Symmetry: C4
Subunit: 388 residues, 4 copies
């Protein structure tokens, strides 16, 4: 109909309720489920769906061997009905590639897939299910993007890309698209020293992205975008409650404009909702591996370098595997506020579980509740032994 | 379009005709059928569908081992086309959880799923396929609901929940929802001493629920709801034709306001159509187990403590496994009256058939006929030996 | 929109072109294809689909053992997209039962399924996918119907049913339905001595049904129905070109009002297009078994007791298995005439191929061409050995 | 809505971006994927889909044995969602046969399938999913057509057919269809000596077809059609950059009106975009087998007998199997020009890989970009050893 405008603020997050869970690995042990990774969730005005990068093979299939690898010609961005697993028969291919993002502007959806060899990748921007624009690699070193939904305001959908080194300064760009066309792009500015895999959400005409500094920071970089002025700023979450993985133990004081040191060249896609006292941070429980997952209410985390948790909710036990996590919201829901949501990728297989030769995942997702709900843990649920 | 109003009375039930049957267990022996239990049927203005709580695994899958358990993080309310089996590829997830209800108000559908550990469960009410309201456990002991469809009148959809003990007094509440929002809730009143798993239907602006007294009664408690005044009453079916399972043998006189004694802390979800002389009761044939199923016309069963059968129809032979049973009607059918319908869950596997490690079921459903139709029996039809 | 009216006459049939073929048995050797029999084809204003009676199991499934049996509680009328096979995942259940018919009146579809034990069967008439009317057995001996599509004119859809003996006089009735309701029914009249499994088509406000005399005739009985007056007549195809199976060899003169003798208590569902010189008869090539299939142009076959073929087309070689055959037309196609169509059931398995324990079939269907097209043969195509 | 008119010219092709890839063989190793060959892509105003000739069996199925054969009664033209594989459950049958073409005229789609024995084949033209016209073989020797999409202009959709010898002069006809009806047909004229499997596209009210001279030419014949005047011309691509397979090595000067000699009675379906300096030719890398695939910018290839490449892009490495290739465009995309697209059939199995008994393929497809994008190679990706 008309382009969606981020006119609402976030609902008060007093807890998280279960939203969707596909049990993909459990089910796929005996059905035609595609191997995936890098999943996310994204809504259209009339439906919300699961998304992920397929590996072009079923989990039980012999070609599942080797799926620990991130980039190949057999990957594609696929979407499928909420809480169903990604099967060969119900998965819709959005585009071909090994890195992606996607978002609905209120009229139709834009999907972006990057493919290519490491030194010669290219992004193709699809709009209304047709290819419209292409962008060639600018630094010839793994052109890559969000791996979770983008956000639009009045037809303008900003997207963060990075090209170049993963362990030194790289060239990050913010593209402002409208109907799949490039209105403008800027180089990253601000104090964030390295950006990768941004998780974004929008509220009150502003888009907030919590990304990952693979190079040096264990605290997360944040990019705040003005989609009208088509400008942005960047900094790090000030809070001592560190949210990357791996990471050092939490200090008593964090860093607002520099990476918090202790762990180099590694990390995991993650997210946060930065809204004053209504601030919630997601993170793996383990400081060493992609294990467990918890949400922590850390009032003013973005700007307070001594902020610590006032409430929390465990999502996945530390004795269970987690993975990437990102933000999304149903911008077309009823009500006066946007309900914050997120997903956690529950990785199974390699490298942690090497008795099998594949790597895949399932998805669990929650949204906020203004109630103070009881908590449960949500593991993948599959028994690896069954796959042997 | 407009909210549906319960303006019609029930059609005269002179017999029951076959409505739907999915043969899920037979088919699933060699196809991707999800393991389920707690099924039901519910109609939208343009389609009627089968519903059930998936176990997050196929029957042939290795994760089917252990599905005798009722609550886990791998369950979800799913719906699928009438008479098809619940397959991985055609099952639509309504919400995540281990206890549910769902009903269409004429404009859109409300689905409710409860999830959580036993001492910290919560219900999330979905409307128009979006989460709208959440209710935290009030007694910290297995918050649970109907396991069959709710009913709406002018947008108001009452739902019966129970939280607390299964073998002593508990806290049952009647919630009046409208567009997924809580208009009001009441504690249970009347003479019913314990309520669980209500089976409801509506006619002439009144909603009748036949539930189960797990604690003491072998006769069934009944809750009659006024969805306009948003008030209710409760009693037991007066009839000596006892309809819970297990149960003692039928006496010559029943109880109207107390549980009929003889069997404690056990029972099965069931239903009835209480409409004066047009009254029909469903029940297992066996007084000891979930075996067989029959419909008995017991005129004035609700109010006559000496009422006995005047007609009957066998649905499932006593040599075949049955299970839960509940009511539903197509409130959007043509004609001058609502045609009473019901389903019977045909449980296969554990605990009765323990040579297999799973527990699942298929569904059979009938609706009333004003004709006096010949009868057939409708078993699940699967051979357990094939699964060995 | 509006009820369809049989305003056109048949197109001139100069040959038959391939219309649809599902290769169900070939495909089902390694995919989730339901076991079926008694198939047919029927069109809606916007789509034409394959129909059949499922056996409630896949062909590869262990429950396929015993599917030679015609009636069980596990059968149902299913429909699926033209030329696709009947799979667990794409088959839509129309109703439950072991004998059926179905037809679209231009506004919506009426489907009829009969279920029950032999002495207590009942038909339930569905309209707009809802049960509307039920008819109890009148002779307590296998109430049964067409097994191919019915035909409507101005909302009136006549259907032929038979109840009683298969080897002596029975009680055949013609029901005139409108919106699933019974407007009227008549007992069979005319000279046809026994009627079963009528194959019908409509043209110029008249409905012609070629049925089967299981009792005595090797020539086929024909019922011509006036859907406006709601009256009918019956006789036999006069032609010496005999079209039942089994049957004696063709004589030089046939019978117009008596069964042509030579074979008792057996037969096969079949069809014909009786339109003066534009008359075409279908039949198995073998006089002993359901083997092969051919179309023969026999001018004035219905009324000329010495009529013999003037043209022909082989459909299935005598070295290949055939089975039931029936008529249907797309009453919603463009043009000035109705194009005659038919299907042939290609039965595989028992009793002819007893190395397997199942019985199923695939479907081949053709429509007429005004051209004189070259001919091909169309076998099922599966290798039974693969199933061993 | 209204018939589409070829009002735009081609976009400038500066490189090719990835459009779709189904990874059919990889996926089908462990899922219900139909065996196919002769694939293509074709768009409707609201969706673009993959098309191919099914073999009526899954790849893992036992009936896959022998699928190297081109014509049988078990083949059919099927279409399925872009980039999904052709599965038993998502494949839509357009018509039955072993040679086909299909195209949308802006209002609805026309599909053509030819079936029959070699000496008695016939084409049936479907429009709006109904059979409308039939054409009998005129030379009694494998009536055959494009194997890729046709193109329409103001409702007129020309199609090229060939009947007769594959190794001597044959009878090629150009049919001009409108709503499935024949408006006119012409015999082939011009200097092309033999025509088979034309790949066509339209721009500025002209339709260009790059075909294959199976008899003598290693350079490709080209047919340019005027869909308004319903007339055409034919010649060969003048360029010395030879594009059939097998073929001799490239000379320094080609032939404009005669086949370039060196290889007789063999070839492969291929295509080209002939647009002055914006000319791009596709071809296998190997001159001996269907191995590899590359796009070469050869300015004025059609008319310049000394034209050589000025740019290029490798699509499939010479160490990977290719096959047929053809053209298609989304005539309903936004913008001022038509974006040239093509697909490459990646054949697996026999005859090159004879350790398996089947022959199938997957599909890769690209569209042009005005950018100068980096290149990747796109192989089928399956490991034959897994199928052993
Ligand atoms: C039924 O359901 C309800 C609802 O869920 C249940 O109630 C919830 O219970 C939760 C668990 O108790 C609770 O979550 C905790 O909240 C704490 C904050 O509240 C307390 O402090 C505030 C502020 O003073 C008070 O107002 C309030 O009254 C409380 O006293 C958080 O602090 C908790 O998080 C910390 O602990 C957990 C372990 O429990 C860690 O995993 C987590 O990371 C936090 O601790 C680490 O980080 C901090 C900050 O840097 C460090 O100081 C600390 O030492 C830890 O650091 C180590 O560990 C991390 C992670 O591994 C590592 O990176 C670091 O380097 C160190 O090694 C926790 O979030 C909910 O708020 C509460 N909800 C409600 C509404 O009440 C109820 O129990 C359930 N009922 C039943 C019967 O089960
Ligand atoms: C073709 O189809 C038609 C249509 O279906 C077939 O006709 C039907 O036939 C049915 C079977 O005969 C019949 O069903 C029975 O109806 C009885 C009522 O009718 C009779 O009584 C009335 C009232 O006097 C008369 O008007 C009428 O003329 C009849 O005489 C019911 O009473 C029957 O139910 C009882 O019996 C069955 C076993 O048959 C039990 O399973 C059932 O639970 C009932 O009996 C138990 O309960 C009562 C009440 O407390 C006890 O008194 C009794 O002792 C039993 O108690 C024990 O068992 C229960 C259950 O296990 C346990 O809990 C308890 O503790 C005790 O141990 C039965 O419903 C249909 O009405 C009839 N329909 C029609 C339209 O005619 C026809 O036969 C078919 N034709 C062919 C050729 O097959
Ligand atoms: C390319 O394609 C074209 C188009 O398909 C091919 O041309 C077609 O070729 C067909 C086969 O030749 C042909 O079909 C036959 O047509 C005959 C009628 O035409 C002839 O007679 C008329 C009338 O005089 C002439 O006008 C005309 O010129 C012809 O001369 C039919 O009579 C044929 O049917 C009979 O024969 C077949 C076997 O071929 C039997 O299976 C069939 O049942 C018919 O014969 C039985 O029945 C009759 C009637 O009672 C008996 O008299 C006879 O003895 C047989 O009876 C025995 O067998 C039956 C069945 O088993 C049993 O029940 C009984 O008891 C006895 O045991 C046949 O239909 C097409 O018309 C023709 N089409 C066209 C447009 O030309 C062309 O060949 C192909 N090209 C190539 C290169 O292959
Ligand atoms: C990142 O991505 C970019 C974008 O893709 C990469 O850049 C591309 O690199 C490509 C590979 O170098 C390049 O493709 C080549 O383009 C040549 C034309 O450009 C050159 O000549 C023009 C004209 O003078 C100059 O303007 C220009 O500056 C260049 O110098 C083509 O000529 C190439 O095709 C020929 O070579 C390939 C092998 O590379 C053959 O397979 C192909 O068939 C062509 O050669 C055969 O055919 C010709 C014509 O008859 C014969 O003369 C020749 O001898 C060959 O003949 C034999 O082989 C054939 C085929 O087997 C057989 O039939 C015959 O009988 C003989 O046996 C090639 O197309 C892109 O244009 C370029 N793109 C851009 C935008 O720059 C970049 O490298 C990537 N980066 C990294 C780091 O990898
Ligand atoms: C989002 O904001 C823009 C205004 O910036 C709205 O766009 C206007 O919509 C009406 C109706 O389509 C037009 O007549 C105006 O010209 C539109 N645009 C501009 C850019 O002025 C848009 O409708 C808003 N979206 C919603 C859902 O209300
Ligand atoms: C069910 O009853 C309510 C009346 O209580 C009907 O609601 C009215 O509908 C018309 C048309 O939508 C409105 O103009 C009235 O204001 C509505 N509501 C009320 C609450 O007054 C409703 O239409 C009835 N449903 C049906 C199917 O007739
Ligand atoms: C089939 O015939 C009936 C007439 O018998 C047509 O029905 C009339 O249709 C118009 C428009 O719906 C009405 O105003 C008339 O009253 C209708 N019926 C009768 C029974 O008189 C019907 O439209 C015809 N069908 C088609 C497709 O034209
Ligand atoms: C393609 O060209 C034809 C004109 O040749 C357009 O057809 C005209 O469309 C309008 C509206 O449908 C009619 O009133 C004219 O009579 C149509 N036809 C002719 C043949 O004159 C057609 O609309 C054009 N297609 C598009 C998409 O614009
Ligand atoms: C099922 O689980 C039980 C309990 O863990 C185990 O002992 C049993 O062997 C399992 N059965 C199968 C077939 O795996
Ligand atoms: C099929 O059933 C028959 C009869 O019960 C039995 O003897 C036979 O062995 C079964 N065949 C198979 C393969 O199970
Ligand atoms: C395939 O068919 C050939 C030829 O009939 C046969 O010899 C061969 O063994 C078959 N291969 C397999 C795996 O069945
Ligand atoms: Ca880091
Ligand atoms: Ca399988
Ligand atoms: Ca009880
Ligand atoms: Ca007979
Ligand atoms: Ca050639």
């Amino acid at each position: 109909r008309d382009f969606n405008n981020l006119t609402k603020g976030l609902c008060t997050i007093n807890s998280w309720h279960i939203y969707g869970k596909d049990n993909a690995v459990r089910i796929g042990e005996d059905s035609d489920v595609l191997v995936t990774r890098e999943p996310y969730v994204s809504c259209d005005p009339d439906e919300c769906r699961f998304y992920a990068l397929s590996q072009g093979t079923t989990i039980r299939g012999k070609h599942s061997n080797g799926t620990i690898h991130d980039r190949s010609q057999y990957r594609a961005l696929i979407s499928w009905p909420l809480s169903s697993p990604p099967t060969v028969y119900n998965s819709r291919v959005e585009c071909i590639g090994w890195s992606s993002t996607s978002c609905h502007d209120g009229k139709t959806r834009m999907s972006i897939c990057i493919s290519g060899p490491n030194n010669n990748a290219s992004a193709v921007i699809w709009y209304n299910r047709r290819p419209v624009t292409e962008i060639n690699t600018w630094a010839r070193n793994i052109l890559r993007t969000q791996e979770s939904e983008c956000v639009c305001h009045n037809g303008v959908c900003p997207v963060v890309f990075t090209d170049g080194s993963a362990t030194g300064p790289a060239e990050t760009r913010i593209y402002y698209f409208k109907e799949g066309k490039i209105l403008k792009w800027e180089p990253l500015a601000g104090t964030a020293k390295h950006i990768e895999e941004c998780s974004c959400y929008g509220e009150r005409a502003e888009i907030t992205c919590t990304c990952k500094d693979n190079w040096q920071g264990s605290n997360r970089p944040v990019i705040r975008i003005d989609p009208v002025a088509m400008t942005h700023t960047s900094q790090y979450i000030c809070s001592p409650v560190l949210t990357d993985n791996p990471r050092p133990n939490d200090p008593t004081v964090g860093k607002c404009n520099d990476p918090y040191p202790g762990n180099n060249n590694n990390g995991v896609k993650g997210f946060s909702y930065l809204d004053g006292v209504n601030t919630w941070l997601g993170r793996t429980i383990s400081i060493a591996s992609r294990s467990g997952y918890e949400m922590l209410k850390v009032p003013n985390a973005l700007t307070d370098d001594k902020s610590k948790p006032t409430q929390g909710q465990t999502i996945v036990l530390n004795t269970d595997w987690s993975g990437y996590s990102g933000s999304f919201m149903d911008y077309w829901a009823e009500g006066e506020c946007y309900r914050a949501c997120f997903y956690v990728e529950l990785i199974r297989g390699r490298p942690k579980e090497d008795k099998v030769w594949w790597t895949s995942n399932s998805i669990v997702s929650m949204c906020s509740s203004t109630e103070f709900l009881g908590q449960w843990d949500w593991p993948d649920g599959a028994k690896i032994e069954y796959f042997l």
